[PDB]
């Protein structure tokens, strides 16, 4: 068949459904390349999972990401979350394990919000 891995990414009320499959090296968001994300200042907020680990590791894979919900900013925190999760859950499945712990230690030292959803649940004092 086709080796794929599906991971999610979630900020305020925005989901991000990133299918990652072995391919040629195209990275789409909503049927559009990742060089055309809307807010235009926060475009480097989604180049973080591309440029932190190194752009070589996207040479064989596809990143189809589709997002709904949220606003202009809180979608950009969802596509940077589901690309980081979609990359680091393909190396534990279909590529080598020692790749994954190199990635999971790379995204961690930069920003842990790439991986686990920082849930700002309330607190009563």
């Amino acid at each position: 068949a086709v080796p794929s891995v599906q991971t999610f990414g979630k900020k305020k009320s925005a989901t991000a459904v990133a299918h990652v499959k072995a391919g040629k090296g195209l990275i789409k968001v909503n049927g559009s390349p990742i060089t055309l994300v809307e807010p235009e200042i926060l475009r480097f907020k989604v180049y973080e999972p591309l440029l932190l680990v190194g752009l070589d590791k996207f040479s064989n894979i596809d990143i189809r990401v589709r997002v709904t919900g949220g606003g202009h900013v809180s979608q950009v925190y969802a596509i940077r979350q589901a690309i980081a999760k979609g990359l680091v859950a393909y190396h534990q499945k279909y590529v080598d394990e020692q790749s994954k712990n190199e990635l999971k230690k790379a995204f961690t030292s930069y920003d842990r919000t790439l991986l686990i959803a920082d849930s700002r649940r309330p607190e009563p004092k």
């Binding site: 891995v5 991971t7 979609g86 680091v88 859950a89 534990q92 499945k93 991986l115």
Partner: protein, 157 residues
């Protein structure tokens, strides 16, 4: 044939399972009886069955801990045979039927906290009844999350 008749309703491995409970469920009443033969204003006796109804309610064989009459009348094997694990997986609507829950336990899809459980006939405490889930990365917890279109393979669900 009461022993067979409740082995079917709850699905039991050995037909001897019933009388393996009904020896305990009789042993409750024999301790209930001799604790009824002590005089009523005895601080042993007043302490001692309330000590026991704490345990038989935590395990969940009896519905309430107030009525003292339940301890001889409502303590039945079919009461203790529905805190079985496959009945609880049918009560919590995990599996569709009660045979099918035995099919999922024996194949190894269900767990209590850390460790998965493999004997079908695991008694589950009412306190521990909170913690039964599908075992993680299973093919039966993966299918559930596909129905709501909410898988997340970073969990490798």
């Amino acid at each position: 044939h009461r022993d067979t008749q409740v082995m079917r309703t709850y699905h039991i491995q050995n037909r001897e399972d019933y009388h393996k409970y009904n020896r305990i469920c009789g042993d409750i009443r024999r301790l209930a009886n001799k604790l009824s033969l002590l005089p009523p204003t005895d601080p042993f006796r007043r302490k001692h069955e309330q000590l026991l109804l704490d345990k038989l309610y935590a395990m969940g064989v009896l519905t309430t801990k107030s009525k003292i009459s339940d301890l001889e009348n409502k303590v039945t094997v079919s009461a203790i045979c529905r805190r079985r694990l496959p009945v609880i997986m049918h009560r919590l609507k995990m599996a569709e039927t009660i045979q099918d829950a035995v099919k999922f336990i024996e194949q190894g899809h269900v767990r209590v906290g850390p460790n998965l459980i493999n004997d079908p006939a695991y008694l589950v405490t009412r306190n521990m009844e909170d913690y039964v889930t599908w075992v993680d990365n299973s093919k039966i917890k993966k299918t559930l999350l596909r129905y709501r279109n909410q898988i997340d393979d970073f969990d490798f669900s």
